[PDB]
Structures are given as C-alpha cells and as structure tokens.
Amino acid sequence: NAMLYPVLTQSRLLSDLSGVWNFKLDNGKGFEEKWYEKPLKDADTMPVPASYNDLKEGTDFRDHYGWVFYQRNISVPEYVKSQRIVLRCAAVTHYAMIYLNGKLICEHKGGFLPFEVELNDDLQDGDNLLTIAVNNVIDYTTLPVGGKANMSDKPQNNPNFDFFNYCGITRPVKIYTTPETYINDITVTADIDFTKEEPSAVLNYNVEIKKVELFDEEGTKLSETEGSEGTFEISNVRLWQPLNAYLYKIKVTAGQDVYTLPYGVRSVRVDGTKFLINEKPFYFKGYGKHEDTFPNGRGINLPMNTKDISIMKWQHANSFRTSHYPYSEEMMRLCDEEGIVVIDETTAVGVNLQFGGGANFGGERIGTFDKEHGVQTQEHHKDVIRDLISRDKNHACVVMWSIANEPDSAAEGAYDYFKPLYDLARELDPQKRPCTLVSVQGTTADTDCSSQLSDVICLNRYYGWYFGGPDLEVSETGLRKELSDWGKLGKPVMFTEYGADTVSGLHDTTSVMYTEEYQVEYYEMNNKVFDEFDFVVGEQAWNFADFATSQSLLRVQGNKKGLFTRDRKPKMVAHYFRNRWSAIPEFGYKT
Amino acid sequence: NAMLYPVLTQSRLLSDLSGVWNFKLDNGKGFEEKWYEKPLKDADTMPVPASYNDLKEGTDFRDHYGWVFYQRNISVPEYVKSQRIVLRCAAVTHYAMIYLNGKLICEHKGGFLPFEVELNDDLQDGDNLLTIAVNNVIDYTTLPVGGKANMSDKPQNNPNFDFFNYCGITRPVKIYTTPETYINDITVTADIDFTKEEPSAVLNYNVEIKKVELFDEEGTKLSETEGSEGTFEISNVRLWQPLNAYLYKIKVTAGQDVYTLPYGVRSVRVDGTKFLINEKPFYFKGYGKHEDTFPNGRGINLPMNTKDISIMKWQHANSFRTSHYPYSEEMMRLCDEEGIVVIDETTAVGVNLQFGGGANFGGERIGTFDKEHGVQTQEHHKDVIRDLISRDKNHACVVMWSIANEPDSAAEGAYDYFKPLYDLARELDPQKRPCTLVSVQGTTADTDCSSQLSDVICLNRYYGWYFGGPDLEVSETGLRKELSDWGKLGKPVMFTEYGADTVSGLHDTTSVMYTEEYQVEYYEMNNKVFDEFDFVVGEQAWNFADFATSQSLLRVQGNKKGLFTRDRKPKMVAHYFRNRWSAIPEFGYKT
Amino acid sequence: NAMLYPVLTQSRLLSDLSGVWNFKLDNGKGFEEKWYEKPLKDADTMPVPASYNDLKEGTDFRDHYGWVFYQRNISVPEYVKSQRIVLRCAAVTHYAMIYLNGKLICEHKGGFLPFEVELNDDLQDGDNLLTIAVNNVIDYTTLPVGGKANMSDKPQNNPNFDFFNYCGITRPVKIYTTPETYINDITVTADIDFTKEEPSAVLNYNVEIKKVELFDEEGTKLSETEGSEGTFEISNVRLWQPLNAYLYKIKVTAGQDVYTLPYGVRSVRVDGTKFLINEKPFYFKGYGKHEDTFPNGRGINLPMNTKDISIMKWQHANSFRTSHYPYSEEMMRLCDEEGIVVIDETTAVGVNLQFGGGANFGGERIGTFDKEHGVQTQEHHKDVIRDLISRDKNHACVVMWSIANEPDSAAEGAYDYFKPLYDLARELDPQKRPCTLVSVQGTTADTDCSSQLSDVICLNRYYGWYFGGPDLEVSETGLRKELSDWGKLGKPVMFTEYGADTVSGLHDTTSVMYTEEYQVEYYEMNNKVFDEFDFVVGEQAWNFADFATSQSLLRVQGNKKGLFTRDRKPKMVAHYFRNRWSAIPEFGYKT
Ligand SMILES: O=C(O)[C@H]1O[C@@H](N2CCN(C3=Nc4ccccc4Sc4ccccc43)CC2)[C@H](O)[C@@H](O)[C@@H]1O
Ligand SMILES: O=C(O)[C@H]1O[C@@H](N2CCN(C3=Nc4ccccc4Sc4ccccc43)CC2)[C@H](O)[C@@H](O)[C@@H]1O
Ligand SMILES: O=C(O)[C@H]1O[C@@H](N2CCN(C3=Nc4ccccc4Sc4ccccc43)CC2)[C@H](O)[C@@H](O)[C@@H]1O
C-alpha cells in the first residue's frame, strides 16, 4: 500500500546494501537444489543496483531466460533489534522471491515499484544469508506484456514493447528501522487561493500510523500543528513552478518516530483546451524518456539523472514522461528540486495484441481483450495504479497520470478494461490530477476510448516516419487532417511521441531517412502543424536519447530516435529543439 | 594510518550517505560568509559519489577554479550514540574540509585515498548540517602535480599530467559504528610451502585494537585461534591464482566487535628475469586504465567496474595498473574475487618539470628536484605510500607497487628523492612485494634511478607514435636497440604503456595515423619486438579505453589511445589483442 | 605563353587520351635503361587523368620518392597530318618529361598549369609509343616548396605546406589540331558605361595568330567585325553577376581556323574600403578549397566540381579561392556559367622558411629570402604568374589574383621578392584586376609587405584554434585588436582562412575542441567580430571540405577543418553558415 522514501531519521537508520553481491544464473535445477539455503557455489559477481544483462559477455547471458540468484551476507547488531528492521526493495525486475537463511519471506510481482518486508522475526543473530531470486519471464499476465514473437523451441522472452527486457535488482535494496509504532504514510494536498494578488494556501494533511512542523527552503521554521489530521495556513506562499521549484519541508514527529518530507505547493487542473499549472496556460516542452544507460541497463543512475536534467535546462525543455514505467524515487525527488514537470506513467505497455501478427487461437486472430485468450493483466494493472499513486502522490513534479502506453484502446473490450482503472486513478489521487492514456497510431477521436475516459489527449504519431516517410509534405497533410479531427473534443491535445531514427554521423545536403538532416526536417514539418492548433498544449519528442531494444531488422543497434546518443551527446536535432524551445515559454504560448 | 573497508558487521552499522546533496560553486566570498554554518542558499543539486565536472553545462562550470560546497542534513538515533560514530570519506578530490553544524572537524590532502573522522563529540541530537568543501587546485605541492601551462590572468589549473582534473566527492561518504574498543587494523601474510607436491601454507596474523576464525569459500569453518597475534596452518591449500581466484574468509571477533576479511593465499617474488606468482613465471597481459566514465568523471562506477572485468576476461587479459592513482576499494576487492593482477600505483604523476616548457626562475629552466623552485611533494608523497600500502596490504590482487608514473627519474635529485620512498615502500609492505616506478620515454638503463631502486623495470614507450610515427620500421629498430640495452640489468622488463591515438570509425586499406589499421600495425610492430626478449615479462597497453583530458591541439576530444571507446565498445585493435592474448598463457610464456 | 582551352572546332579536332595507361614506378635504374624507348616491361595499370598516390596499396607506393613512367600507344591518321597536331597536357605534377618513340620532345616544370608540344615532325605513321615521366620531388626550387622535415636516410619529400603531395598526370592529356596558320591567343576586355541607367558596354578585342562574330546566350548572332583588332558595342548589355551569370559567345573565324570563346561582361575595381563588382559593394561569402577527392587525389573530378557548386548555391556562398594552386580549366569555365566569384591563386605556397624549425646553415637559422641558402623560386614564380594570367585572363569568374599563400611577407627580402611579381601581375592582366597575397598569422599592418603591394588585405587567422583555443572569449579580444589595426590602411580587408579541426560525429553539450559544437562556436565568435568592421568585405572559411595531408600528430587523417567531409557531407557548421549566408546579400551588406 504505502511506501515512504527511506531517508536517515533521528528515529530510523538506513543501511544501503548496494555493492557486489554473489550471483548465479539459474538453470533448470536451481530451486530443486534449494540454492537459497546454502551459499552459492561456483558463483559469479554482480553489482547491485543494476540490470544484469549487459554486465557479462555472451548472448546466452544477455538473452537468458528465467531466474537468476543474487546472494549477500547480512548482519544487524543486537543493540538495534529493539527497533523494527524493514527490508525495502526499490524495484526488482520483474518478479522477485526473497529468502533469508533458506526460508521464503516475500514475493513480489511488478518490476518497477517498491515493496518491503519486515525482518525482526526471522532475522537471526550473526551473519544471515540473504538471497533474492529474480525472474524475467514476460507474457500475457505481466506488465509490461510479453508476446510470442518479435513485435525455435529454446525458451525465449519476446517483448510486446520496443525496449530491451532489462532485469535484475534494478533499484537499491536498503534496510531502515522504525519505532514499533511508526509513521507509515503521509498525505498532503493544497488548496490555493489565487484570489489574493499575493496568493496564499492552506495545506490539508493526514498521517497514517501503526506533532507536525513546517519549515521553508532555508530551514526557517514557520508553524506547527498537533495530531494525525490538521491543517496549515501560508500567506504570500512561494509557489512551486516549472523550471523554478520551491520546496517547503515538513517534519512529522509522532511518538519516538519522526520523518521529514519535501513538498511543493502547486495547482493543476484542465479547463477546456488549456492545461493549467497554478491557473496558468502551460505548454509541455520535453520528451519521452527511458531509464536506459550503459552499462547499467535499467539500473538506477543518479549521475545520469542529474546530467539529463542539466541537458533539459540547457535545451529549454520543461517536462518528460516516465515512458514506459515508473522511474526511481530519487529521480522523482530530483524533478521536485529542479522544477521538471513529470507525466507519471504505469508499466502498462504492450496491452495490445495487434502488434506483429498477434496471436491466433483456433486459427482466428485473438483480440486484445478477448477474455479467454487475450490479456490477463487488469488485476495486476490495478495494483500498479495503486502502488504508483501511493508512492508519488506528494511529488509536485507529477502533473498527470498515464495509465497505459499504446493499448488497443479502440478495440472491443477496451472501455470495459480501462474504466475501472481510470476510476481507481481518480479515486486514489488525493489531488485529482488529470489522467490519460497514450494513444497508438491508428485511433481517431471517434474510436478511441481515450476520447471519453481521459482529461487530456496524448498522441504517439509518426507522420513522416512509419507513416509517409520519406514524403514529408504528403505526411504533413495527413497530420493536419488527423489533428483537426482531434480538436472536435474540445480537450487538450499533446503529442507524447514523434520522431525519426537517426544514426549520429549520417548526413546529406539532400536528406534521406536516418540522416540528421532528415530528423530535423521531420520535426520542422510536425512542429509547424502543431503550432496551427491552439488546443495542442504539448510537444514531447521520442526519445530523449538512443536506447537499447531487442534485435530486429528495424532496430539499428537499439532505438535511434534519440535527440541525444545513448551517452547524451547531441545530434543536430538537439540544437534545433534547443533553439525552438528557447522562444516558447512555459506559460501563455497558446492562450 | 589504518583504513579498513567498512562493511556491515554484527558490531558495526553502515549508513551510505550517497544521494543528491545540496551543492554550490564557491566564489571568492564563500568562506568569508561561512556558508558551512547555515544551509546553502540558492543551492544547486549534485549526486554523491561523483566528479562534479561533467554534471552541469557550461565551460565556466567544467573548468571551475577553487572550492565547491556540498551539504547534506545528517541524523543518527540516540539509541546508537552508545556505539562510536565514524565518518569515512572513501575519497575527496583533491582537498576536503568537513564541517558539522558550522565547526571544522577534519581536513584532508590527497584526493584518492580514504580518511575518517569521529563524530560522537560534536554529533548533536537531531538533524545536523553536514558540509564538505572541496578544493581542486593543483600545483607543485599536490600529487598529482599542477603546472603553469598546458602539458590569461583568470586563475586556472593546468595539469602536469594527461588526464582531466576531475574533482568532487569521488568516492562514497559513509557512516559506520564501532564498540568503544574495536578492531582498528588487521594484517595477514602467508608463508607457502611449495615443497609438498600438494602445497600447504601457514598464515601469520595480527590485529591492532584501541578470537580469530577461518572459513573457506562456501562458509566452511576450518580452524580457530585466540588473541591478538597467532597463526594458522592450512594443508592442501587452494592458492589464489590469476584468472582463478580463491578467497578464504577470516572472522576476527574481539570483544563486542567482529570484522570479516576475505584473503587470498598467494606468493610473489622476482627471480632474475622472472616475475614469479606462486613460484611460476608470470607474464602480464592487460593494460593501463583510468577511473573514467561518463558522466561520473572519476566518480566510482561499480557497474562499469564489473563490465570492464568482463571485457578483460573476454579479451584474455590478466592485469592492469591503477594509472595514475589508487582505485576504489570496491574495485580492489573485486579483482580479489575475479583473480585480476593489479599493479597498485600512487598519485605521483607529474613529478617531472620537463613537460612542456617547464618553469624558468631567473630565466634559467628549473629542474624537477631543484629544492627551492622545484617539486615540494616528497613529504606528501610519503604519506601516500603510507596510506596506500595500509589500505591495500591484504589484497591478493596487488602484486607490486608503482611509486610514481613518469617522474624525472634521470635528473639530478631523483635518486635522493626516490630512495626514502622506495625504502618506506619495502618497510611498510608486510609481504615485501616488488616495487617499481614507471619510466618516461628518454631514460636509459644507465641514467634511470629506476635501474637500481626498482625490482622490475616498467617502461612507457611510444615507438611508432610520438617517436618515429608514421615510420613503423624505423621505429622498430629504435625499440629493439633501447630494449636490448635494458636487458643488461638482468631484471624483469615490462611495458606499462604503449599505444596510438585512434578515432573509432577511421580506416584505410593503406593506413595512416589515427586510423584503426594503424593502431593494429603499431601494436604488431611493438609486440613482435617484445617477443624477441625473454626478460620482457609483461605487456600492458595504454589505454584500456578512451578517457577525458584537458583540451589541446593534440587531444581529439580526450585521449584516443583506448582499445575500447569511452563506452567500452571495441576498436578493431581490441580484437587483435583478444586473439593474441588467447595464445599467450598466464604462466610459462617465457621460461 | 598562350594556352587556349582546347574544344571541338570546325577547324580543330580534339582526341582525349584519357584512359588506363601503362604505368611503372621508377627505381634508380629507370632512365639508365631508357624505359621510354621500349614498351614498359612488367608494367602496372593507371587511369589518366588522376593523382596516382591513392590508386594502389601500400605506404611505399603512396609515399614514393622520384619518378614514375606513364606509357600509352598513340596513333593518328595520315588524312590529318595535313593539319598540325598538338599535344596539350592540362597539368602534370610536378615535373614532366614527354618522350615519343624514345626521343625527348618536351619538359615542363610546374604541376598545375597547361603546356603543349607540337607532334607533326616526330609523329611517325602507325602506332607511336608515348611515354610521360613524372617527378614529384619538391624543394627550395619548386612551387610549391618542399622543406627538410614535417611542417632517416631514405629519400623523402617533406611538404612545406599543409596538403598531401599528390602527383601524376593530374589533368587530361589531349590532342587537338590546327590549320598551319591558326588562332594562338585571344584577349577581350570590357569598358562598361554605368552612366546610362540601362548600362551598355564596348568590348576591346585582339587576336594573336601565327572575322569576329558575337552571339548571345541562346545563339542569337548580334554583330560582326573583321580583322585582328577591333571593337564591339552592346547596349542594354546583360551583365555577368555573382550567382547570376550571363555568357556571351564569341566566334573568331580567321582563315581556315575558327574558335569560340564564352565571355562575361563584368566590372571590378576597389574603391577605398569597398570591393566593387559592376560598381556595387561586394561581400565574399564562401571558402578556401582544394582539388581533393577520393580516390582521384588532385586529379580532375568534373562530377565533384558540379556537386561542390550545387552545395555552394545550396549554402548561399558566392566565392572561393583556388587554394593553393590554379584549378582546372573546366572548373574555371564552370564558375563562368554558374556565376561563382573566384580568387585565382598561384602555386606559391610554402615561400616561408619559418615553418617548423626551418633550416639552419652554419648553425644559424636561414631566413626565407636569404639569397644563398633560402628560396630559389622567384624566376619560376614569375613564369607561374605569366602562365596563370595568360590561361585565365578572360574568365569573368576571376575577380582578383593571389600571388602567394602565406609567404614570409614580413621578413627581410620580402618586398624585394614580391615587388617584381606584383608588377608583372598588374602588367600582364589586361583587366587590371586587384592583386593580393594571403598573409600568414603573425604579420601586422605595419610589418606586412602586403600592406603596400596589395589592393586587398587577405588574412589567414586562427583566433580560437591555434591561437587561444579553447578560450574563445580571450581569442575574440585578440581578433578585434588585430582587426582594428588593419583598418588603418583604409583598404578592403577579408579573411581567406579561419577554421577549426572538427571530426564529423564528435559532440558535446559543453563543447571541446574537435567537436562540431566547438566548430560552430568558433565561427560565431569570429563572425561576430567580422561584422563590427565595415572595411571587412569577405569571409571565406578554411576549408570547404576535409582533405588529405602528410601524416603528423596534428592531422587526424588529413585536415579536418572542412565544413563538409571529404565526401561532401555536411557537418553541423555547414548548416550554421547556410543560415548565416542566407541573410547576407552579395551586394550592399556593408555600404
Ligand atoms: O517508434 C518508436 O520507436 C516508439 O513509438 C511507439 N511504437 C509503437 C509501435 N509502432 C512501430 N513500432 C515498432 C516497435 C518495435 C519493433 C518494431 C516496430 S515496426 C513499425 C512499423 C510501422 C509502423 C509502426 C511500427 C509505432 C512505434 C512505442 O510507443 C514506443 O515504445 C516506441 O519506442
Ligand atoms: O601517450 C599518452 O597518452 C600517455 O603516456 C604518457 N605520456 C607522457 C608525456 N608524453 C607526451 N604526452 C603528452 C601528454 C599530454 C599532452 C600532450 C602530450 S605531447 C607529446 C609529444 C611528443 C612526445 C610525447 C608527448 C608521452 C605520453 C603518460 O604517462 C600518460 O599519462 C599519457 O596518457
Ligand atoms: O590551419 C590550416 O589547416 C591552414 O591554414 C594555414 N596554416 C599555416 C601554418 N599554421 C599551422 N599549421 C600547420 C600546418 C601543417 C602542419 C602543422 C601545422 S601546426 C600549427 C601550430 C600552431 C599554429 C599554426 C600551425 C597555420 C595554418 C595554411 O595556409 C593552410 O595550408 C592550412 O591548411
């Protein structure tokens, strides 16, 4: 349910278990021989946190099918078993199974959101053998979704999505402590009064448990209130803004336990064809990104996180989307301090069995939401919407939720699949932030169950690449026509993906596809049409940087639609966008 | 003096402070306004650990001169002030100044070796403001050495060495605990009896403090001895080998404190023209490397550390040198588990004022060891040899010490400068491992104070690049002649650097410098001559991968002598070496 | 003396001998064995026209020293010996020696200008063995100048200039015919009357020999005059313009011989700080180029010539300079039709013994114009100014003459060396077009013998590369100061070279030298200062495209200062200039 970001507290420790662990690829005989009971024989080395896929050589290791075993000796002091000892796994991709001294203690499905387990009971005295087994198999029951081919009898994951299936202990595995009665969750909303020309705010609060002090940026304490629930009143409040963050601090002392949380006071609501942040008409400038670096894979990369942010501010972007899964907690906290607008997105990519040849049962092609042969994820999909919104509910950076990336949202079953999730999203988000789903090419205003369920229309369109390339003038005609029609909903339309594979170094004065000149022309065509429609409130390119995918004829050593290379070096287009975004403000570009 | 690697212990905590800290570049008014007393106003963000140089945009930030301020709120629990609270800085580059709540508590010179401070006294109750200031200025008093030009009035570091002056909190800043009477140091040597065809060993031990148990790889406990000093006897001992490591474990319980250490039992001594590991004739296959990745700078990179090791084993290398500074503790422990031969090297690069135009006092060119105007580092140089050997004395991977890289070792003052350091190196190394210094081009057997002080001759030669390029046949003649002469010392000769700048992607059937074909021909010429001399016991290419340097006409976006690119992608030469090293064994290549 | 471009004529044939000839590298015994008498034994193949250097593999072939032998069987019909049979060598680099059936018939020094020989006498009946020997040795007697090192006993050319010493039959070797009394030369000037708002012109003419008809573009015949000398009067004349050429045709029928010549009527004179084409204030937009393509070397490349022109018009350039030698006749005729302003430049590069360490006779460093040990080229230098101006005197494209590229023009002897050449240049150019010399970095207004001899000041400056790089702000200060001072001559100043080596593909958001971002910043800095001075009338970047040079540490597989790669693919800077030159007109940018 509730996962608070572990951070050093007068009440709580925090011991990062990150390092080189023992590691062994599982064969068929891994569990049969209960490798978790005894130290791993003939073991290899593996850093944690990290995707393991690129950290050893050979295709058989990169493309491994199934389980791997991590193992590390753990040891707490007796003088601290007094407090309760929690194990927090920031993320294990995809499915984890945690053993201690040989006994199962936790299982988790879902490889991109945190989970924890309590250790006091089975935590012995001395060096205990911690073993985490990680499974990477994807299918019709996982988010993301594994298919049966590219989007031999040798078992083989086949992603129904266009990124590499990086797995392992993606994010840090820490340990922290907690008074036996402790702060378990905290929720903070903000009603802002833009009536006073010098606006002020009142901050609802509540603390779940099983004394509240407010400070400003510099540590200036300002007010205090007692108890579980209550309120705060701030006048001349410093509003969190895009590219101009301000974080108040919040100290919740309750019993022998105290936790601090940064918070930004910020308004967001949609109003006709206008996305309004602090009651001003916003325009998204940014991109769809990945957690993808070398050689960490999906592994958390704090230096790259900061370098990416620096490149955004250098480029005059203001937002990105957590395509196609929730990002690290550290990244979220970082865009809080840095003032980056996030579109927080779930792991629900590949809910769409039209990709490739799909799957044919009884010779008949199976539809996405066929209830016997199609996707079997809505239960898991709901837990994801639950854990995600619980984890990130307080981040001022989060301005909206993306429930799915390119689902078969114009097919039979789609509305009935997505309605309970949209409902759960608006039910659980204390700030009632707008929800959306990113619509695959092919859908229309009429046919897209997004046209009703979603507060904002988010399109992934590829006119001038997949559709119309290399003829950019013909493709522009296509883009205007489809874009016009979307205006008939009187909702905000924004593009969450559009791009063109571009191999850094390829050029021609008379451009062809894959060259840097073509990439720039492609975006000039699209951006020209975007500017013609005052209900278009955002442009986010795909992708921020080149990233790794499964191999196919259509993937030139990964996805090459980045504006920057995988090591964040600009392509010519990166300087095109920097110059365009320099003349487009965060607020009032449309009005 | 003694720095043991902090790791979770039944007796000791370990709380990694790594994360995004507050950060501010210092102007002239930083200390005058005592920024350490109050939280940093108008502050920026910066991950730790990491070099800060590449993590924000703009030359003024990359090329910053002077101080920067890191700042993080810290907080321990009262239920633990019982134990002593230590702050361990794995490395701060170059000069650190640690404040707590506004009061100085530690200073350190030397940016590549660990130091600690005790916190109990000034560690208050609640959230304490931790501030670390970092200085990057280099000169004639620092190791490495800063010069006065490339190797305006605007203050400017000018490295007297060919890598970029990456600074910041390079390595992790952790906190661990310790019973008020604790294990402060541990030393373990090994006398091995190769008389028994099934060799066995006795392991001297000693514990400095202010119960010893032995286990094997799997945790099998084998023996026990009590007290500070003592011994162990192992028969049919499993010897740590190159590319075939075996680590025993060692559990030292003393009082309420217990620490475990991995140890590999291994022999090393030189014998005429033979470098002998476990009394067998070794041959170094590997490279000189850097701690250099993007965007971490010199910052510790555990995933790359493991990926590098995988590439070595893939390439059939067996060794590298910590050019030109001690590497992270984690890396050292890793080559212990992985069986990689290390040449542990100090920060003593640029002890050589002949680089560039040098410096001219009174119009006369200043010699390196001029006692009034030359280098002023021998005092610091000794502390480095002290801290380094103390830190890494137990690593089986360490096979030798490099006291300096390319000092002016054929100049007046050189012997008198290096003798006390060589002496201190052999005095302090409990295993009496061979010592050397890496000799710059130009020195001869006759003129090099290395010919007497050093157990092994380590050459950085560039015949076919700087010297003779592009004429490889003329250059080969030069290399044979100089290499012949070195054979007259009857000592082991090995090359620690040789290479050719190569821009990945450049090619010609008829090669020119900077192409991949030239790089391969260059190494074919050199390697041919190396094979002609049975006293040559090692080949280590410069460099393992492309890395960043200061800008100059001669540096094509860094140093391009890597066999791999900065993101570890092979150049054609990498496959040349893989194929050559496949047919060269670790032992008996020479005999 | 006079070389008219051979073209099919009712009076004259033209048989192109271009093809695969026999070819043999000369060893020491080539002439001793009179290989020219008998067909080449053990011969190789070689296309003509072409530089031979890159057309076979191996450094010994590329870096060959001395002579090579071309050989082709020739054969004319008897029914045509009636007319006189001429052999025209468009260019042989450097020194040629033409044999026929074994007998010497011609010698030529100078590898970039046409020469001919008459064949009737020694032209037998049947298949005659034509043999051309080509020498590539350069030294203090050749233009360009060969030095004694980079700018073993094994003989070796060492260019005193920064391009590769490509040699062979660079340009076509044709045969044409001629009535025994024939048109040998033609000269046409134009006095233009800009008094009439609808300007008109009178065209002086003269024909040297040993009927004149005028047509317009479409073949419209307009007027006629008889005899050797005479005149033409044209009203409402269509003026040849930059980027808007108009070529009249001219049919000179004299006896049994008739030749046609295209001509553009165009005015050029300098007036204070103004370069005036057709009495309007011109501004050069373009570059310094090379005749350099793969694999032709310096060999003529008509398709690239046209592709280059297309790229100029695409980029909005209007001019280039024939750095550093006269280009092909075909190229000149092409910029006539295309309206490209040419700066016609001689082979006089490397008249400057300060490059490198120079040469030291008697231990004393030899000055450039030292009359016993220095350059010995002024005699040859005059013949070059003679042949060049004779060849290209009628090309409307030629707007100016460059007598030398970067001579030691601020040294003792310089004025006395250049005065007789400047004089000869103005004496021989019927149109009295302005003359200049391109000034190496280091010279000033005061010290440059160009400040007096030259009508226009042409600078090769590298502030922000060689001088000041990577500090572009410091370098800009330097450039303004030197540029200011040049304004004190009240003459037109233009830059004929400025640039920065840039390896296509290298990038950083925070730029370093050799990246594409640095190249663009470099030109932004320079171009900013150029715009501050209304006496600056031209910007020509070095270079149009990457080109081949001798190997050295400072040459990353050739010269990388091109805006385009060697295969004419744009670097990012090419699009920077295209966008800047789009807003700068050909006329009136300054006024
Ligand atoms: O274009 C992109 O790279 C991004 O856009 C979207 N895909 C969704 C699917 N479709 C096409 N893609 C793929 C993807 C993987 C392998 C092969 C293809 S063949 C193809 C052929 C014609 C038209 C379309 C496709 C559109 C692109 C995803 O949301 C995002 O994951 C992906 O990265
Ligand atoms: O060649 C390498 O890249 C490595 O080898 C060694 N240097 C030592 C010095 N010298 C030359 N170098 C440099 C280095 C930096 C800037 C400029 C130069 S100009 C030069 C010109 C002619 C001969 C030699 C040089 C040899 C190389 C160092 O030990 C190691 O730090 C360095 O990385
Ligand atoms: O920069 C360019 O590439 C062009 O500009 C001009 N040279 C003239 C000489 N000098 C430098 N050059 C060279 C050239 C060849 C080899 C090595 C060098 S080291 C150097 C070091 C510091 C300052 C200058 C130089 C200026 C550049 C020529 O006119 C043109 O031939 C050449 O191509």
Automatic annotation (TrEMBL), chains A, B, C:
It comes from Lachnospira eligens. The gene is uidA. PROSITE patterns: GLYCOSYL_HYDROL_F2_1 (PS00719), GLYCOSYL_HYDROL_F2_2 (PS00608). Residues 268-584 form the Glycoside hydrolase family 2 catalytic domain. Belongs to the glycosyl hydrolase 2 family. This is Beta-glucuronidase. Residues 15-179 form the Glycosyl hydrolases family 2 sugar binding domain. NCBIfam families: PRK10150.1. InterPro entries: Beta-gal/glucu_dom_sf, Galactose-bd-like_sf, GH, Glyco_hydro_2, Glyco_hydro_2_AS, Glyco_hydro_2_cat, Glyco_hydro_2_CS, Glyco_hydro_2_N. The keyword Hydrolase applies. It comes from the Bacteria. Its EC number is 3.2.1.31. Keywords: Glycosidase, Hydrolase. One of its GO terms (molecular function) is beta-glucuronidase activity. GO terms for biological process: carbohydrate metabolic process; glucuronoside catabolic process. Residues 181-266 form the Glycoside hydrolase family 2 immunoglobulin-like beta-sandwich domain.
